[PDB]
Amino acid sequence: SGVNLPARRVIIRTPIFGGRPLDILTYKQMVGRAGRKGVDTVGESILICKNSEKSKGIALLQGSLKPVRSCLVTGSMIRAILEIIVGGVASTSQDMHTYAACTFLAASMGAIEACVMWLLENEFIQSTEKVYHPTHLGSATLSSSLSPADTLDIFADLQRAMKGFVLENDLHILYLVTPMFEDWTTIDWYRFFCLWEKLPTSMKRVAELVGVEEGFLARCVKGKQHRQMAIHKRFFTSLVLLDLISEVPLREINQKYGCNRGQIQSLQQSAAVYAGMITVFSNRLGWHNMELLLSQFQKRLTFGIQRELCDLVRVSLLNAQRARVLYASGFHTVADLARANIVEVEVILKNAVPMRTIWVTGRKGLTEREAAALIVEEARMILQQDL
């Protein structure tokens, strides 16, 4: 499903992918890369099958991808009506019924009117004379683009930071921006136990405040609760993210956290969007103090930087190390970095090694002389374009 990777021959190992048979939908694009335009006159695919698996394998060759559905109580439809009656375009209930006539479900050929009552129960909409008007929680969910199923928990979770908050460490702030657990990595309980003990006094206070138990953490799982399970994995996700924003080596996290670099950036990119949705959610809800703490946490989770390098990182070619080594060069803001001597940044960028050898996302490789010039050149354009 990714970027086009042309190749003359395509080989598939088994019709069974991860213990399950290969889907036809992904199979069409699975082979579709075979044959380069204007270079290769013939492209081929060789699916590999054994014993009785050939009967299952051949079915994909003569099979066709399944027809599309609408997937529309349903959690994907609650947001649908919330997206229209909160924007103010559709107010009368009868006109809302015509919206359900405009969807994919209607065009394919009851509970739609019974689903707005679900929103009525959860304070998302106030009932008036029927003509519906959004509430403070309803308008905040739409602006931040969260699913209404998740918001009910967040609203009761963010409001539980009202009772008690810690500020020495970023853990409690990070705990409220970790999205979920999904299946981003396989947990290691014994490894978590050793990490649980070595945690400092400040961080252990956070866990008790959000429901994580010191007495039960990597203790009962060894010897053997869905909402309690979604909290412990949420805490582990927050522990990993705190090391990410501390700029610890990514290799070191592997040796310490058990999850490899592939699932780390697939989480810090996903958790950075969450911090960009909680911040907007708290902005529209009139929580000006909470928006202050989470305002800078979207930029920190994306790039794995500290507070110091937030301004340096604004240049698109400084991801996580090209700004740290540059920061030690006496350049602490992007304003005066834009005025750096061109020949000066060449030597400092040469060092710190863990002709197109330096890499920048989007333009493949680059040479050091050009990229260092691009560091200043991009900094020129930022200073006057935003003022």
Add this chain to the structure above:
Amino acid sequence: SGVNLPARRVIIRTPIFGGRPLDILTYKQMVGRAGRKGVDTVGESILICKNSEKSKGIALLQGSLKPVRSCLVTGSMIRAILEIIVGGVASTSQDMHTYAACTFLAASMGAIEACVMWLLENEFIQSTEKVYHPTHLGSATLSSSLSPADTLDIFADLQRAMKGFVLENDLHILYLVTPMFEDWTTIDWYRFFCLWEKLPTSMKRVAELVGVEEGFLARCVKGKQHRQMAIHKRFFTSLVLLDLISEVPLREINQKYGCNRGQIQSLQQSAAVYAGMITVFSNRLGWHNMELLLSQFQKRLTFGIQRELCDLVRVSLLNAQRARVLYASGFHTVADLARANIVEVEVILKNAVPMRTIWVTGRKGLTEREAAALIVEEARMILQQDL
């Protein structure tokens, strides 16, 4: 200052005792045991002196006992007038001034009336038309026989356990009954730090609730606050006492807690009186809840037993082991221990070894057959005498 120990010769090491010159008062009784009555016709005392210390040493010989004082703002006088006007005997202020004419200070030959004003400020006394009446705090302090200086802190300390309490472990209850630190032992910070880490999760919750800091505990003292000092040493006294009421061996405490067995009994006997004063203090103050929790903690601290052996220990001949081994013999209460077979308790008492060899306080040594018969015989008298 203890029990008489006659001897024909008494020899003293140095006039300097513990880095200070020896007092005259203790010197009269220092060698007064020399010469047995009706056995020794001559008793002698030989003080050993060196170099120039002989001039200081001879002052002991020709010295006379220092004249007595009264030591009577003064903390020992606040209790003096509280103890009388709260009993109802002295009410009028002029009669109180007459009482101050009856003291040792008066008979030896201004601020007496000013010390009442100290009691007025601290709510110990309500002011009426001057005729004075007790308050709820004033009548509770007298009955429990606590110094008014200590009560002001206890009342706030015991009202902080009002808001938050823990019950799974006996630590927080023990924290409210540890008297002070005095100079019962020399603290070991590094050993406490290792002990601080190995504390379970439940006990560490108590320390944060009473002012003890996980971050600062055997951390700053190594690298280098009187009320903060008196709390940490209070916590150590409560930490030691919990092992005492867990029936752990006293030898093991020495290897683990660093304080010798001599200072342990000098604490558990002193801390047992405190539990007998806090319980009475809470009784008169109308706190019927922790009067229940602290009711059994005077007997536990005196004998270093658990809850199970509270009834067995009522017999004066079962201190801390003679009841534990007897408890495992199927005898769990003093009611049915009174009906035990005489020959049965002989064999069980013979075992558990860590003719008059078994020892009982107050009667020197005893033989096993007599003492085992005394275990039952004392239990006979208790059953009907108390009913």
